[PDB]
């Protein structure tokens, strides 16, 4: 490339290609992201302003021979593999809290500034050898719009409706979440349909006391089968309930229940919040 070399493809991302690139002047290491609009150039380098401790950092948005690519700073591992590779002993619980709290903080960051992720999963949080985590991508979604992994896709979304909110988010975390603790994802889906009722399997299908408006929502169907509520200590054992009272504050069903990050931060459960080192093999 005219002022990146390409050192390796890391994969491939939502929007296109991501590659490990070095900054020909620069000489620094970076996440290269080719983007497969006038509106989404100038909504996306709003972005660049964005800067928080566990926000990935957009460096650059670069508009060149008529293709698009966005420049992120680099982190060695994302929560996906870090996860892989702590299966057999788990993730400590200590770090297990670290991270949830250093990811709320992320989120109630963007969130007071008006912007969404969307599409949180394991794969977009990156992590450091110092113990940081930081999310990537958030703002993406609104800007660019329409095997994707359904897993951590809030139950509003599955149900139809086109207007989100802060609330998609902390569903998202709050599954992240419960897999950290399980070493099992929580609701894995192969269908949106399958996705819906595993969650309903699990929290009991909606109905319009824990969720007004459910049954007006654009693809809610009245022959969903009814599902009784499971009972949470089953769910994510041996997490303390400490944890499974936060967890469940975050998988409310109407959104607008759903607690806030900012209000997640305050509960109980990171009274005794540590910044442990992680054991990281790159
Ligand atoms: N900043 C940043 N550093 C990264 N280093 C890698 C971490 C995992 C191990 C190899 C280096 S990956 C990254 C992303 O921002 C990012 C996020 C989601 C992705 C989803 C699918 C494919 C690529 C993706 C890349």
Redesign the pocket.
């Known amino acids: 490339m005219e002022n990146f070399q390409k050192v390796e493809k ?5 929007y296109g290609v ?1 590659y ?1 690139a070095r900054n020909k002047l620069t000489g620094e290491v970076v ?1 290269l ?1 080719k983007i497969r609009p006038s509106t989404a150039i100038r909504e996306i380098s709003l972005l660049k302003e964005l800067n928080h401790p566990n926000i ?1 950092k957009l460096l650059d948005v670069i508009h060149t021979e008529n293709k698009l690519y966005l420049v ?7 929560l996906k ?1 870090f996860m892989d590779a702590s299966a057999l002993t788990g993730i400590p619980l200590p770090l297990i809290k670290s991270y949830l709290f250093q990811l709320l903080q992320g989120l109630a960051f963007c969130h007071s500034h008006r912007v969404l992720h969307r599409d949180l999963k394991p ?2 949080l ?1 992590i450091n050898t110092e113990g940081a985590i930081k999310l ?2 958030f703002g993406l979604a609104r800007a660019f719009g329409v095997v994707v992994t359904l897993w951590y896709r809030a139950p509003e979304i599955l149900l139809g409706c086109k207007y989100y909110s802060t609330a998609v988010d902390i569903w998202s975390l709050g599954c992240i979440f419960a897999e950290m603790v399980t070493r099992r994802a929580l609701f894995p889906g192969d269908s949106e349909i399958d996705q819906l009722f595993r969650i309903f399997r699990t929290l009991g299908t909606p109905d319009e006391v824990v969720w007004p408006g459910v049954t007006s929502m654009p693809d809610y169907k009245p022959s969903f089968p009814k599902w009784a509520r499971q009972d949470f200590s089953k769910v994510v054992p041996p997490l303390d309930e400490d944890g499974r009272s936060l967890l469940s504050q975050m998988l409310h069903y109407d959104p607008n229940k759903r607690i806030s990050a900012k209000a997640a931060l305050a509960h109980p459960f990171f009274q005794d919040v540590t910044k442990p080192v992680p054991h990281l093999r790159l």
């Not at 890391?10 to 939502?14: K, L, P, R």
């Open positions: 890391i994969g491939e991302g939502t991501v490990k996440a992201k990935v992120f700073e680099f982190l060695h591992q994302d593999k794969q977009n990156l990537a991508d």
